[PDB]
Amino acid sequence: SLRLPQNPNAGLFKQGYNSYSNADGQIIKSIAAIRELHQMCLTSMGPCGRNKIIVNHLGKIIITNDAATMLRELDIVHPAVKVLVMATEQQKIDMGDGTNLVMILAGELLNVSEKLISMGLSAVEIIQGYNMARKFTLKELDEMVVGEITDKNDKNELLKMIKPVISSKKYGSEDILSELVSEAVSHVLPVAQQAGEIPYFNVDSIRVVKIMGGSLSNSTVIKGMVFNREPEGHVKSLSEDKKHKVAVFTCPLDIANTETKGTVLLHNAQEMLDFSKGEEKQIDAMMKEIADMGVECIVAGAGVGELALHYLNRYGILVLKVPSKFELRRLCRVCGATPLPRLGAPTPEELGLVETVKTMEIGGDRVTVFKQEQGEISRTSTIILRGATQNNLDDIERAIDDGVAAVKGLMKPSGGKLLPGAGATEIELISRITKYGERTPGLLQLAIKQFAVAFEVVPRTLAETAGLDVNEVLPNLYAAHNVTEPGAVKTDHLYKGVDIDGESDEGVKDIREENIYDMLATKKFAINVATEAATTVLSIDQIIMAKK
Amino acid sequence: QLFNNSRSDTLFLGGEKISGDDIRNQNVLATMAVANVVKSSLGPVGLDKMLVDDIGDFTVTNDGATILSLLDVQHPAGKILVELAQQQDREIGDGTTSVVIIASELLKRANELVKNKIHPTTIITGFRVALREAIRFINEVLSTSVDTLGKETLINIAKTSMSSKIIGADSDFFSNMVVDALLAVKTQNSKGEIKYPVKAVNVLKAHGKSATESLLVPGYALNCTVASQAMPKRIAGGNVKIACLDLNLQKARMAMGVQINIDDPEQLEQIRKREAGIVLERVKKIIDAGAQVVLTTKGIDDLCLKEFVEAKIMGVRRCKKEDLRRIARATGATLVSSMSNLEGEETFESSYLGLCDEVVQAKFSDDECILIKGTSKHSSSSIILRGANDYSLDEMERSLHDSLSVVKRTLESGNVVPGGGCVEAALNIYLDNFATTVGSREQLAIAEFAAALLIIPKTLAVNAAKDSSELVAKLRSYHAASQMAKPEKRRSYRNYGLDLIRGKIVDEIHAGVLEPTISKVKSLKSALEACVAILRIDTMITVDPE
Amino acid sequence: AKQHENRLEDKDLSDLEELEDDEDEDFLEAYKIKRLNEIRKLQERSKFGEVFHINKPEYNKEVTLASQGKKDDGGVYVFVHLSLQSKLQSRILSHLFQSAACKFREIKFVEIPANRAIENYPESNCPTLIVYYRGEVIKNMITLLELGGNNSKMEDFEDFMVKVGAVAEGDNRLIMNRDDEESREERKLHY
Amino acid sequence: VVFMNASQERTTGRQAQISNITAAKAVADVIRTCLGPKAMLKMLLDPMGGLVLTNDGHAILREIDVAHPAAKSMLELSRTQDEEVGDGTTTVIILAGEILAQCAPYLIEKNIHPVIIIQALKKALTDALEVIKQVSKPVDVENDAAMKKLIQASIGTKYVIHWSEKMCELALDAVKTVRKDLNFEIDIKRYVRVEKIPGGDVLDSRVLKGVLLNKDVVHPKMSRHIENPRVVLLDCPLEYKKGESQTNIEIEKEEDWNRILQIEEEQVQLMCEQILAVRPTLVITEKGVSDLAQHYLLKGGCSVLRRVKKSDNNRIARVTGATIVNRVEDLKESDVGTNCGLFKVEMIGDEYFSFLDNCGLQKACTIMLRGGSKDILNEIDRNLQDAMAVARNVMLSPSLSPGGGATEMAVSVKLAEKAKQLEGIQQWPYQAVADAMECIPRTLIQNAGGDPIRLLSQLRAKHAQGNFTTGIDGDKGKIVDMVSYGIWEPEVIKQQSVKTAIESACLLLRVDDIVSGVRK
């Protein structure tokens, strides 16, 4: 009476282990545990989304409005929330676009499932309901598609691609940020029209180097690349035309020492006198074959000796440090050189082509530039991103990664296959999925119905973040899809969507003239991985933890 | 704010020393820290709060009168706002939430004037000339309350006091209740001056049906239990006599320091009998008077209960002093502290007894209450509030108690003004033209004083979770044309405010919301006198306890 | 554990009769004989009951010998009062002595003028309250600002007697423990 | 420089409401399985050590101390429902939780203001009382056969449904005894006595109209069997009353001390002679009795019993009609009780019990419950309190309604028809009230072990045809009408439930900030 028996036969397992079954409203608590961090994502989706401060134990801060990025640093206790972390991590790695959406949907499917489990629907039927809804959802995304790119390189078409992507992360001004990406995409692409070759594009080609100071308007698009290096011997503006040559060596510019106990041995004074001059003549003789080929800059892979440096700057050969593997490989793709570890003569076919190598003050430190010209184009271009706050450089840099990741979406499938944005693609599926529930019989119809109700979060979120009342903006938009028999045949009611700024009522003046669209490849895997996030959380009825 | 200052550098004080603009900033954050809990409770869109005493007990409260009294603050600059909330509850009885927000913003908006090298003496002078100019403008714009032939100058007054409460939806039912209650308990004093004693009506903490089905008692309801269970509970028939006694009726000892001493043991039993008999002689003459109902402040011993059970008299013990004066005042009796007269004899006259039509004891959810109705000489009233529990009824008790004070003032002073931040927005347009006339440095003081008055209509929109600038800009547009009305009624664009349930600007006279002008007068002076007290402080000297 | 002890500890000889029908006779009457013996000891110890207005020669006996009592260490507390009729606190303390004398008959209540007590005593320090016990001074109390001053009451004086060990904490005669009959009547009805 | 000794930090915004609504859901989850005829039982470990086995809602909530302050508003609803009626306590908690649970995704999702929801609940409550008035009907109150099945409705959830034939007769005779003519039924539970006797058999019981005392006579010569007893109630002790004046006697002569003790004997002699002025046969006193006074009452045969409680003396007064008189001088023949009989003291080894029976319409009785343990005696005793609690309202008002989820379903169907007809901003929370009444039928079905998705789906189509008396059976789970079985409850239970559920939701929905540290 004074004390319970405190759960007998509990010594089967350790004291730290705990069980969590579906009963006792614990599945409702797991939905509430998702609801804690899901509401943090409500303020972070859309162009009016708000970034988030995340102070780690080390003190490294990252400011961001994306989900996959913010969830990396937060240490999570609930395992069901970690499914959303790895689900968004999969979204960032594969497609690099549409992660707030994964969280927003996989969280609202669990929200509407709170009503379904409370009604009395078995968990097995819930998975069958969303799977049958998923097959119809992915089918209709291919049907209501409009428009296509059909050209890899164009000035006006890239404005339709990059601009709606970076509009979520650090909107700012539209033109100054979009032109930096569309100019850099055209440099790296192998155009090769009327040849029948397979296109190819690498995410690691376009890379952004962060430099403090300046303003966002002063950002330029560099053909080549840049490091924060210092030439050792001398600096040269290189005002001499008639382009220079490039030779890349991965080994250090020094005498190839013996790997096993390299030690001097001098038996008599005759070897003592010649050993000091032998190293000078040997290093000089190797530079003669290198210098006669007309090379004026050599990129070293490791530490360079002083004696080798004395003969390099004699003939005015520039030295560059790249003490890492990937930093040396990215530079060969610009000039198109084939490195060889030997210290002999570079082959003439393997020598690279760089016209000028300038050294100027951008951020107060010494930097080396490798700008090419219109002739003999190169790939793996960089973008000089100027800004005041280092935290803003980090989020804008990842926005270029999201934009570069969107360019990857054009290579693998047959084409662009753009969709209407601004909630139009979500609100259209609500009517189609609702009609699909009426066609199918059985107790799964409520699962099909709640699956459509979960898609309202995109227009509800954009209306809440835009400072508008969602009770008036949402049903005003339903009138465009509740309508029938209106004059025009060629119907233009599909482009109606929400609006962040402007006219009252809100149905946007089309997403058309506005030139904002969404990618099909993002919506396919996002709805697939979001449904898998809700499937794995709803399919499990018992959870076991340890130590907490 | 940044860091702690040096502790008595070549000054030799046992406590702490601080000076400069740092303490002036701490007073602003101190007034804003205590005002943030009052922000969300303002207006009908505000929500209630609960204060936990770390013993399980909690109480729901909306008004900042008792909230700040319960919140034990140690900073003395915040204590003035705590006492300001208690001060405004005593005199006016309404607007405790508004003076804290107004006084805090006047100090907050004046904080910018401090670092402009404007002295506080010049700032308060600019505030004071704006005050007396605002009081005269309030005296020009207000209106008397006979107002119209229909009443509804009292049904609409109750809605303003009843708003922002749990029973604000039921204010249509309770509006008729409060006006019928205070019109019954009026009195006469000072040769024609009518008074309305607040708290004279009995607010009972009943549980049961709902707040909508709360029956208004046409008479006073005494909250006390019956002595014995074998007594008659219901007494019918007209002209029921009410006896109000206060003397000690239980058997008591002799004088406070005397000792009973007797040699003859024969009379030892006789002195015991007369001590038991002398207390029953008082009960004998009350039965001869024929008092059906008798009420006593002190206890009632079993020696007296047998006579009341036999003669069918309703004896009730454990009455309080303040209640029996209202029973005697309502039923027409007079308070009897002891039975005597100018002559040497001891007797009881029938004129001391009151009169009422019916007395019935009722029980509802373990709450026995004696319902006294039909007082012949003067009417009375009581309100039986019904809800979930006692802690929810405490909010209703404060809601009703504040409603009586507001309806008290509109009858004592017929002048009223509309709500919804009308006068707060009208004074800004009046003071801007006056600020340019005075010329010199007081323009910024009068201007920033006017900007601080706009916080009342702004807080109504912020707590509503709607767009505030559109409502303020539209309210600004109509009030801007009021000063330039160009008289020849067609004097429109005045007496308008915010409508939060719909989000539009409509006429407050037709909407049915008003407030007395005297509440605006005392709130502005008490808010400015509190602002004068905080601005004039320069350096703090906190002495640690020995 | 305390529920079994409250049956006997929290009931006097008059209150122990309540449990005559409920509890066992041998359990109850065994304790009533114990409490009855304690009542008889207090009657034998009741050697006092009014203020002893004494004079000095006698002090050397009344105040001190008494404090020894039987000298079985039968000690006796002796509250002395150096009275001064000009002071207002002295007349208040004289009333408390006679009131407490009628209740606590075992404790001796002594009074004497302060001018006759000590040669050239400071009038400002009067009224003075001394408490002797077995010849030793237990408490040399100063003027009644500690006990409220001018607003001193009978409840404050009885509380002081418990601190010096003159009266037990749970004594039925103390006003703190001596609840009114009307108070206990309401408790039984609401129980 | 904290500025606040009581929670300078604050939990404001929507997170305070999540803690409030989730706490309101948690108090309903621990008693979700405590509804219907197949409901389970619970055990509570109080710190004093007195265990109790309970299924009624009021006994569960009152013995559970909760640290969450917002939850405590839900804990007190069963306390309010108990003192008002005494039946239907569990439905108020789960209904209030479903209203708060259904109204949760509107501030999060729709961002609708709370004060608009407050207006929506009042109009729903106004329509809820309207349709309950339409669904209810009157019946005859004087038919004893009809009263048995109404008492059996609340008994069906409890353990004593197996003895429902005995419990209905046990409670129907008791409530009719204390009932009188004069709110037309002013009788009160305080007059009804229920003495718990461990041991015996629950099947053997009877409604004796009297007052059962738990003590023995004071002297052995007294006869324990009286044919025509005469009850006289007294407040004065038969002992010598000590004067509160503290009178001291100065004895100088030798005969004074002997005369005092002779006056003590003479006073008890004169006092006992006045008792015999009206020659009683049974005397009752609430105070002690001296051994000197016992001898003088032997000649008259005045049986005395001492240390009787104050409430028991009032219950003895109403049965026998005797008047409580303190002094012994004012005894008259009218003061002496009459129309009493069957005074007998049954010998039981535990304690001595004395019975009473009759031959100023107020009456009283004592229900002697027999069982197997003291804890289940409290269970059957609380069922008696529930047995008469359901019987008061049918006697107060003749109005009557069905139950078993049917009356709650009728509220949801009528509200759902007019919810689409409203077409305004308040219609979203107005639909939540119609969905909130579905928990009760659902709860009943779930406990019964049926499939609630299809049983309630056809129940929607069944009530759409235009009938209201169709409920859900608790054993097998049919859609059979309750007219055949006879599940009927009063209207006051469902009226107090929807009122207390709506009024409790209005209290808790208007909270946005939580603070502590006051220490009043």
Ligand SMILES: Nc1ncnc2c1ncn2[C@@H]1O[C@H](COP(=O)(O)OP(=O)(O)O)[C@@H](O)[C@H]1O
């Ligand atoms: N200016 C705008 N007007 C209307 N809709 C917009 C605008 N900018 C963005 N959107 C919509 O907001 C949505 C936000 O998508 P989001 O998940 O943030 O993309 P990302 O994966 O880059 O984070 C887009 O799908 C787009 O349709």
Ligand SMILES: Nc1ncnc2c1ncn2[C@@H]1O[C@H](COP(=O)(O)OP(=O)(O)O)[C@@H](O)[C@H]1O
């Ligand atoms: N129905 C309403 N419409 C517009 N404004 C209102 C309404 N009710 C109250 N107010 C405003 O709220 C302010 C303060 O209200 P009050 O009743 O004092 O709140 P509390 O009772 O919490 O002190 C008033 O100045 C008034 O203008």
Ligand SMILES: Nc1ncnc2c1ncn2[C@@H]1O[C@H](COP(=O)(O)OP(=O)(O)O)[C@@H](O)[C@H]1O
């Ligand atoms: N055998 C049954 N068949 C159908 N409904 C039942 C049955 N037993 C009980 N009920 C329903 O369950 C409810 C239980 O009421 P009761 O146990 O008295 O209080 P509470 O509702 O608080 O548990 C009744 O209102 C009744 O309608």
Ligand SMILES: [Mg+2]
């Ligand atoms: Mg995007």
Ligand SMILES: [Mg+2]
């Ligand atoms: Mg008010």
Ligand SMILES: [Mg+2]
């Ligand atoms: Mg019940």
